[PDB]
Design a protein around this ligand. Sequence first.
Ligand SMILES: CN(C(=O)c1cccs1)[C@@H]1C[C@@H]2C=C[C@H]1C2
Length: 210
Amino acid sequence: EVETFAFQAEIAQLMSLIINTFYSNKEIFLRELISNSSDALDKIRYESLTDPSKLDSGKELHINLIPNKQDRTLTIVDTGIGMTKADLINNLGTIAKSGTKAFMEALQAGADISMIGQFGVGFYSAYLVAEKVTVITKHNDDEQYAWESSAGGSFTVRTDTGEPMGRGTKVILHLKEDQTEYLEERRIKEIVKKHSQFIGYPITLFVEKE
Ligand SMILES: CN(C(=O)c1cccs1)[C@@H]1C[C@@H]2C=C[C@H]1C2
């Protein structure tokens, strides 16, 4: 059972601006997604101080970067707090409406796409490099869900039947054909060192077996 939803109009306009604007500095997408993972890890770390049982679904707090040249995917996995169904369908998009409006005003005033994280809508920079994004997520208070979108104004949410995650979020970037540099180990290392060197959780870059 797959449910299909329209993006709010502002968010659809934002993703079309991200997909259609000429902007060469695409690598900032990785900083934004790692920043999101770090925030999610911060959240479960704080909550577990007053309720240790929140870590029953996994005590390790980390971020894994998993390129896959065969599937042409880059996966960012964290063991943070995860996202509920209502987060996916309504809450986070509602919050993103004001930040989207502010970011688009700033872009008219001379800002540039690299500043997107200062508005809280950095996730959508994934569409700088990805033609489709799948998000698998598990919150302690809800079931495991798959969110997916190829832009175009709509997204889907379904219950996930894949491997159980425990707790956290997995962002699967289905990369555009000309963005496969972000599958290369030395390129990912360079980007993490440049933009994410002080993230307070272990970031493990998986290497490919082939
Ligand atoms: C995956 N995703 C996130 O990881 C975060 C965005 C902002 C803070 S976390 C989002 C959930 C909903 C589905 C995709 C977007 C909107």
